Design a protein around this ligand. Sequence first.
Ligand SMILES: O=C(O)Cc1ccc(O)c(Cl)c1
Ligand SMILES: O=C(O)Cc1ccc(O)c(Cl)c1
Ligand SMILES: O=C(O)Cc1ccc(O)c(Cl)c1
Ligand SMILES: O=C(O)Cc1ccc(O)c(Cl)c1
Ligand SMILES: O=C(O)Cc1ccc(O)c(Cl)c1
Ligand SMILES: O=C(O)Cc1ccc(O)c(Cl)c1
Ligand SMILES: O=C(O)Cc1ccc(O)c(Cl)c1
Ligand SMILES: O=C(O)Cc1ccc(O)c(Cl)c1
Lengths: 235, 239, 239, 235, 235, 239, 235, 239
Amino acid sequence: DFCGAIIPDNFFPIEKLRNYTQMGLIRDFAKGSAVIMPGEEITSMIFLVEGKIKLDIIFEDGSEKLLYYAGGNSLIGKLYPTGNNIYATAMEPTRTCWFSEKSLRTVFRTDEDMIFEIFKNYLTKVAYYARQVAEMNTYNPTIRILRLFYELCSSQGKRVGDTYEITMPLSQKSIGEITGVHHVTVSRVLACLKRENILDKKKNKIIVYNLGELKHLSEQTSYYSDPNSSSVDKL
Amino acid sequence: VEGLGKDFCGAIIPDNFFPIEKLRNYTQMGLIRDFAKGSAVIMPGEEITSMIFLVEGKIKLDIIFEDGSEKLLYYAGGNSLIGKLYPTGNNIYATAMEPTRTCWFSEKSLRTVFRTDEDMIFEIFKNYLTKVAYYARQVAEMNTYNPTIRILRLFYELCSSQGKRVGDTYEITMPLSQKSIGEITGVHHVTVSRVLACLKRENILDKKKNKIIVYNLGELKHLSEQTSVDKLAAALDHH
Amino acid sequence: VEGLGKDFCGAIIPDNFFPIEKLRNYTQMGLIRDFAKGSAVIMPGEEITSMIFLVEGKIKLDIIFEDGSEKLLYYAGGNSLIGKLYPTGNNIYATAMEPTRTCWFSEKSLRTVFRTDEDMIFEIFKNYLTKVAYYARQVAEMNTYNPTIRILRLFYELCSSQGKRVGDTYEITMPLSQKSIGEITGVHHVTVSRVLACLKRENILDKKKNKIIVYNLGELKHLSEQTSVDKLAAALDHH
Amino acid sequence: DFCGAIIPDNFFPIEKLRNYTQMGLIRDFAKGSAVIMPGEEITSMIFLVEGKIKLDIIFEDGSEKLLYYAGGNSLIGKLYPTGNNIYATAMEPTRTCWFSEKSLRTVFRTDEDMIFEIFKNYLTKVAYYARQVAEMNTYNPTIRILRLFYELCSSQGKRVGDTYEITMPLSQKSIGEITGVHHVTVSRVLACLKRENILDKKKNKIIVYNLGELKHLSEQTSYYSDPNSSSVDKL
Amino acid sequence: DFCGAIIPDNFFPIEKLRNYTQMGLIRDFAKGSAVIMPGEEITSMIFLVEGKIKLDIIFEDGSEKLLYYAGGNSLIGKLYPTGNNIYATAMEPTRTCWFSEKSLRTVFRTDEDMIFEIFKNYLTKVAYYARQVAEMNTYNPTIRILRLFYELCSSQGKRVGDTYEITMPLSQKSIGEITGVHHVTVSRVLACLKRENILDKKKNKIIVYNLGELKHLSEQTSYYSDPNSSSVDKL
Amino acid sequence: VEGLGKDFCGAIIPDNFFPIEKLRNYTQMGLIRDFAKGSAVIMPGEEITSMIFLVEGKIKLDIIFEDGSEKLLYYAGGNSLIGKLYPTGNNIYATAMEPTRTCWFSEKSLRTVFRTDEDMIFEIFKNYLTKVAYYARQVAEMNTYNPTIRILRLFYELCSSQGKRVGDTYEITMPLSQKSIGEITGVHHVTVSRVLACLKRENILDKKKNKIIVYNLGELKHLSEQTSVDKLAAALDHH
Amino acid sequence: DFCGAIIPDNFFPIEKLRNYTQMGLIRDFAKGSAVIMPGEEITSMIFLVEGKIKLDIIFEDGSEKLLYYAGGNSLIGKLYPTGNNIYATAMEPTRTCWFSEKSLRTVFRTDEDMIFEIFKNYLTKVAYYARQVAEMNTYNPTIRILRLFYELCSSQGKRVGDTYEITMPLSQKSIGEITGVHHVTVSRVLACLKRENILDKKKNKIIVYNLGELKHLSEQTSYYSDPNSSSVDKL
Amino acid sequence: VEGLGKDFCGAIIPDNFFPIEKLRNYTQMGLIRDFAKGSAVIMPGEEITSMIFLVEGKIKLDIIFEDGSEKLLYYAGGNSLIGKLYPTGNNIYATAMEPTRTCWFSEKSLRTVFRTDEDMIFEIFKNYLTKVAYYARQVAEMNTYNPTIRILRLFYELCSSQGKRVGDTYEITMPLSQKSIGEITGVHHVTVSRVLACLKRENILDKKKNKIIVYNLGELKHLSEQTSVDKLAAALDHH
Ligand SMILES: O=C(O)Cc1ccc(O)c(Cl)c1
Ligand SMILES: O=C(O)Cc1ccc(O)c(Cl)c1
Ligand SMILES: O=C(O)Cc1ccc(O)c(Cl)c1
Ligand SMILES: O=C(O)Cc1ccc(O)c(Cl)c1
Ligand SMILES: O=C(O)Cc1ccc(O)c(Cl)c1
Ligand SMILES: O=C(O)Cc1ccc(O)c(Cl)c1
Ligand SMILES: O=C(O)Cc1ccc(O)c(Cl)c1
Ligand SMILES: O=C(O)Cc1ccc(O)c(Cl)c1
C-alpha cells in the first residue's frame, strides 16, 4: 500500500514460528539495548516474540538510515552475511528467539510448512524494496542523460566505421537544462561515458564508440508498443 | 567469478543474483518451458505462483506501474532464480533477451525437491536474502525527503507536550481538523486523509474528532525524525 | 492617506485598490444591495456580470479552486471597486466582513454613467491597472521553476541545430515520440501530452509524428530560457 | 487554461482597435529595438498592429523576468505610472499605435464599445495574474507558520489579561520541521511577529499579544464549513 | 580598529551634550521598549544619557540586521528622513534627550563647539561604514566580470565604427569559472550589460557598444602605477 | 533633478551626495584651489582637516588599504562636499577627473561661515546623514558571515548556563584556554587572541585565566545571534 | 612548496632507472591511451622514460579526481594492490618501462643504490599527501564537535559511577552555531557518539559513557604546553 | 587480524600501517632505543635519517606547522615502521604513549639487512605503498576548492583562443598584468605572484611582460578543470 511510502513496518508476520521457540535460543533485550550491534555479523533468523525493534542501516560515511520496524511475530532474515552494516535496537522490553541454520533444519524437519512461510516473508520484503527503488528511480537523472544521447544518436547518428558521429554543439549546460540535472551529475556522467569508451562529448561533435552499451545503460522500455502487449495473456 | 552485475558510474546493473547451479539437478521435478528471443516469460496481468529457474539464456525483468510507466528491476542469466512463488503487489513484465530455457517450480514441486535435498532450502534463502540486501540498501542510500512526515512530526510534538499515558498508549485531548493539519504542514487535505488512514491502520496513531490516540510513540518519534527525491510525489506519480 | 494595504514581514495585504470616491455620485444609476456581516456577496458558482462598488463596509474576496482549496485575493473597503464585469475563468467567493452597502453596475448602467461623466472611464482603467501591476509583480517576484520548460528547451535546441526555415516557420525533420520526450526531460508522458497540446494551440510549435513545426522560434527560445515553487505542481495541485 | 502556467501570451486581442489607428500615433520598431526602454515612464496604451513584443519586468536587484508576449491585436495597458520598471522588445519588425488618454477620449467618443473591449482586456490580465499568485501561494510558508501559531493558541492558548499564553517549548527547529520551512524564513517571521507586537516565541512559553492580528494574517478560510456553502446560490 | 569588524559600538561619544539636556526633551524607556518603532519617521538627534540601545535596520523583505549599539553619551543622528526603516530598542532602563532642529539651534547659540562635536560623530560613522563597504566589496563579483570584459576588449578589441568587437567564444560557464562567480550572477550581469547597450556577449563574438561606460563601471584603479604616487606629497 | 547617482544592475554609483549650492555664497571665507585633470586633490598620506567644497568639476574618491589595494568610495560633482574635517582612520586618494575648482574650509573658516549663516550647519548635517544612511545600508544589505562570532556564541552559551550575576556583570568561573576556544570554533589561535582583546577593550567581556567576566550580556547575546562575504577574511586581506 | 597546493607534479625523479630498462618491459602508449585502465589491477612499478601521464583516482560513486601528473623519470609505485581504483592516461606519445617485483630484484642485485632511490620516491609522496591531509583537516568539523564535548566534560563533567554527566541544555542548533558546522554533520556525529556508547546528548543533560574514547577521538595536542618543548632537542 | 585502524563515524584512525613482524629478526643490525611514556621519540627540529621500527609499545605521530599548529598523522604499534629515512619538508613530533622499545635503522644498517634478507626491501615498499594509498585517497576524497585555479583557468582560456604553437609550447602574445589577473579572478595580487612563480618553476607556463609561454597545455587544461575546504586558505593558514 501507499502506507509503505511512510511506514516500513510489520512485514509478513509468522505467528506459528512461536510454536518452535524451543528449537531456537530465547534472548531478552531491555529498552534501548542493541539487538544487533553496529558491525556485528549476524548468522541467524531472529523471531520477535514480544516487543518492538527498530532496524537501521549504517553507511560507510557514518550516516544511519531506518530500514524498518518489527513487532510481535516479525522475522529478521539475516541468516548469512549481507554486505550491509545493520544495527537494531529494542525500543521496549523485547523477547526474541534466534534460529541458526542448524536449528532451522530441525524446525523444517518437524514442520515443512515453515519453509514456505519464510519464503513469503522474504518475498514480501523483496517486493516492497524493489518497488520502492523503481518508483524512486522513475526519473533517475543519469538515465535521463543517457536517454538523450541514445535518442540523438538514433535520429542524428552518422556511422563512421565502428563509431557513430553526431555533428552538433551540445553543451553540458544545454544537457543539464534539457534534462533538468545538476551540472555536477552531468560532468560525472560525461567523464564516466568517456573513460569507459562508450561516448565522448566534444564541443561540436558527439562520438559514440559503443552504441550497444549506451543503449543497454539507457534502459529502453517498450511493453506498450511491443506486440506482446496486443493481448492480456501470452499467445 | 562474476558478481551480481557490472557497475556503470557508481551504479550496479544486477544481472546475476545468487545463482543456484545445483537446481539443475532437480529440473525433472519442475516444468521445462522454452522462450524465444522477445517472448514474454511473465506478462503483467499474469498470476505467477512458481519459482522460475533459468537453465540457459537471459531474461529482462521489469515492473509495470498502474499509470503504465515501466522500470527495470533486474536481469537474469543462467542459474538465476526468479523467486515469484506467491502473488506480490507488483505487476511484472519479463522477456527473453535471447533463446531461453526455464524450469518452473510450483510449491508442490519444491516440497518434492526439498524432500530429496534439504540444502536447497537454504540456497533459496540465500538468494532471497541477496535480493533484500541489495534493494533495501538502494532505497536507504537515496537522498530522499518525504513531506508527509511533517504530519507525523506535528503529532509527535503535540504528543510530547500534551500526551497523557493510558496503558501502552498516549492520549492527546484536542480537536485538530485534517484541513488545519494540511495548512500547517503545507500538504493537500486529501493526502492528509490518506496519511492519517495509514497511521490508524498500522496502529501508530488514530486521529479522532476531539482526541488523538497514539499507539506507538517510539515508532512515531523515530519515523518523525526523518528527511533530491520526494517520496510522496514518487508514490503518487503512477496514480 | 492610505495606500493599497498594510505590510507584514515583507508582504502587502491589499485592502484598498485604487478607490473611486466619485462613483458615489452615480449610485442612482446602479442597483444598491446591502449585506450583513458573514453574508455572501459573491458565491462561487454565481455568474457575475457587474462591477460592484463598495459604498460602506468591507469585503473579503477569495478564489475557490476546483479541488476545493480556497485562497484570499484581496480585501475591499469603502470606495473599492470589484471589476468583475464579465466572466473570468475563476470561481470567486466574497463575504461581507461587516455590515456592507454595495452598488452593482451592469454594462448598461456603466454606459449611462460614462454618458454623464467621461472621466469615470479612466478612473476604472486606473483601478484595473493597479490590480494588474500588483499581481503581475507578485508572480514575477516569486522564485519559481517549471519542469515543463525542459520540453521547450529540448525543442529549441533541436531547432537551432536541425531547423530549416520555411516562410516564418522552422521545420525539424525527425520522429521524436512523446514517451521519449518525457524520458529525456524527466516529466510524465501525460504532462508532455498537455504541454505539446498547449504549444500547438498557442501557435508556438506543433509536434507531428515525423516533423516538428516551429511557428515562433523567438518566443520558444525566450520561454525556454526560464527557470522554491514548482509551477507545474502548483497548476496540477487543484486538478 | 493550464497552457498559461507555461505560456503567457495573447491576452484578449482587440482587432477592432485597428480601425482607430488614425486617432493614435503609429510607431515602427526594428527587430531587437526597445519598444519600452528600461526606466522609461509610459503613459499610453500601445496597440500592436503587426509583429511580436516580449515584455519583461526589471527588479531593483537588476534581475529581469518575463511578464508576457504580445502579437497582432494585443494591447499594452500602461496608460498611467505603475511602480514597475518594465522593458519591452520588438522581436521582429513591429508596427504599433500609441494612444494617449486624450486620443482614447476621441476613440470612445466615436465608439463607446471600445471602452468595454479594453475593460475585458484588463480583466483578462487581472484574472490571470491573480489566479497565478493564489495557486503559487497555496502553500505560502509564512502563512504555514502563522497558521501553526493560531491553531496552538486556539486550543492551548491561556488568557492572561490582554494576552494569551501557550505553555510549551516549541523550538524554531521544531517549527521548521513541522511546517517544512527553511530556518532562515522561520527566524525572519519570528522576528517580525515579535517587533510588531503580535507574538513572542520564548523557549518554554509562547505569548500572543495580538491574537486578532495573528488570526488576520494567518488567512483563515471556511467556505466549505460555513453555512453559506449549504446551497449553490445565495439564500 | 579590527574590533569594528566584530563590534559596532560606541561611536564618538559627546559627554558634554549632557550639559544641554534642558534644551531638549528627556524621554525614558523601559527594558524592551522601542526607542524608534518600526516605520517611525524620526526628525531628532537622540542623545543617550544613560542606558543601552540596539539599533537595527529593517529591509523591504521583512529581514532585520544590526547597525549598531549605543550607550552613555552616544548620539543617534537622525535629524532628517533617510530612506532606511530603522528600529531601536532599549536593552535596559534608558534615559534619552531628543533634540529637534529648533532645539539644536538653541544649543549651538549657547555653545558653537557642539556643532563640531556632532560633525566628528557623523564623520566617525561615515569613515567606519564606508571603510566596511570597501573592504567587503574588494572582490565584488559583478566588477570581476566587468574587469574581464574590459581587459579582453583592451587587448583583443577590434574597432568597428562606434563599437569594438572581440572575436572569441567565451561561454557564460567560462566566465563563471575564470571569475569565480555563480552562474546566476553571470546571467543577471550579462542581461544588464545587453539591455543597457554596453555590451552584448554572443556565442562566438563579444560586442562592446559603450566601452567608455564599461570602463567606468569596471572601476579601474591606478594610484601605484600613476605618476601621482612617485612622491609621498603633492608636487 | 539628479539623485545620488546612476544605477547599474542593482547598484548605485554615487556621484552626488547631498549638494549644497549655497556654500557657493561663502567661498570668500575659504581657500580656493584649482586642480587639473589627473591631479591629486588628496594624497593617501596627506593629513586632511578641511571640508572640501566642489565649485566646478569632478573628483574621484578612493580609499587605499594598507596592503596597497585601492577601492572607490564615491564621485563628487559640482556642489558636493567632501566632509573630511578631521582625521579618520582611512587613507584617501582623490583625483580630479576634469579641470576642477574647489574651496577648502578649515574649522575656523566654518565657524565664520556659521556666524554669518546658521542654516549652513544643518545643510552639512544633512550631507553627512545621507552618507551614513547610504553606507550603513550597503553594509547591512550584504549577505555576510563572520566566523569570529562563533567565539561570542560560545561565551554567550556558557554565560547563560554557568553565569552568576554580580552587579551589572556575569561571572563565569572556569578555565578555558584561547587554544581550546580556537579548536572548538575552528578559528586560528591568533585570531582568537585578537577577538578576545577587542571584547575586553570594548567592555563586552574579559576572559581571564580562570574566570570570564561578562560586562554586557545583552550586547553579547545579540552580537552572538548573527551570521557570500566572510567579514573576518575581508578585515584581514589588507594586513 | 606552496606550489604543491596547486600542482601535483614531478615527484622525486629517478633518472638512473633509465639505465636498467632492459631488465623491465618497455611499453609505448599513444596520446589518449590508457596506461592504467579503470579497474585494472597493477602489480608493477612503471617508469616514465619519455612523455606525460595524468593519474587519477575513481571513487565508488563514479566520480574521478586527479592524484598527480608524471613526466620523464617519474615513477608510479604500484607494485602491489592498494584498494584504490586508479586510472592513468598518456597525454602525449609516452614510453614506459614496467618493473615486476622479479625484475626489480634483478635491478637491485646489479645496483643496491636503486633501492634507496625508490624509498626516496615513496617518502616524497607520503610526506606530500600526509601534509596535505593535515593542512586540510586543521579545522575538521567532527573534531570541533568532539573537542567541544571534551572541554565541557573536563570543566562541567560530574562523575556518576562509570559515567560523567553534564547538566545543561545544549541544543544541536547551539552546537552548530558555536562550532560552525552544518546541521547535517551535527546529527550524524551525535548519532555516531550515541550508537557507539561514547556519549548521549539529551535535551537538558549530556552523558558521557566513555570519556577516554571521546578524548582519544578529539585529538588533543599539547607540544607547546608539554615540558618536551622546553628545549629544542631531547633531554 | 587487525587492519589499519578503527573507524569512527566514517573516518579511520590509522594505528597500524603495514606491520613487518620480520624486522624483529634484524634488530641486532640497528640501534635499540627505549622511551618512557610521554617521552619525545622525534622532536620537531630533529633531523631524522633512520627508519624507526616499533618492537614494543605505541607512538603518537604528529606534524607541527610553522604557525605552531599541531595535527595527528598516525599512531604506531608493535611491528609498525616509521619510514623517515631522509629529510622531508615536515616537522614531526612523535611521543611514546606507553613504555616503548624501538630499533633505529640507518641507511647503512638497512643495506646490511638487505644483504642478508632481500625480501625485506619489498616489505618496506609494501609499507610505504599503504601509506601513499591511504593519504592520497584522503586528500582526493575531500570536497575541496581552490581559488588559485581560476588563474590557471584564465590562462587556459586565453591559450585556447589566442595561442600559437611553437615547438612543444604555445605562445600568447599579450600584456596582462598580475594586478589585472587578480582583479579578474578575485584573488590578492600577492597570491597571484606566487601562483605565477609556481607555474614557471614547474614548467607549466611563464607569464612575461608582453608574452605568455605555455610549456604544458594539457597539464594546464586539466589542472584548470578542477574545483567545503578552500585549499588556498589551508596552505596559507600556517604562514
Ligand atoms: O541485513 C541486511 O543487509 C538486510 C536485511 C535486513 C533485515 C532483514 O529482516 C533482511 Cl531479510 C535483510
Ligand atoms: O514480483 C515482484 O513483485 C518482485 C520480485 C521480482 C523478481 C524476483 O526474483 C523476486 Cl524474489 C521478487
Ligand atoms: O474574478 C476574477 O477572476 C478576478 C478578479 C477579482 C476581483 C476584481 O476586482 C477583479 Cl478586476 C478581478
Ligand atoms: O506596467 C506594469 O507595471 C504592468 C503591466 C504591464 C503590461 C500591461 O499590458 C499592463 Cl495592463 C500592465
Ligand atoms: O537612519 C538611518 O537610515 C541611518 C542612521 C542610523 C543611525 C544614526 O545614528 C545615523 Cl547618523 C544614521
Ligand atoms: O575620509 C574618510 O575616511 C571617509 C570620507 C570620505 C569622504 C567624505 O566626504 C567623508 Cl564625510 C568621509
Ligand atoms: O595506486 C594507489 O592507490 C595510490 C598510488 C598511485 C600512484 C603512485 O605512484 C603510488 Cl606510489 C600510489
Ligand atoms: O616525516 C614526514 O614528513 C612524513 C612521514 C611520517 C611518518 C612515516 O612513517 C612516513 Cl613514511 C612519513
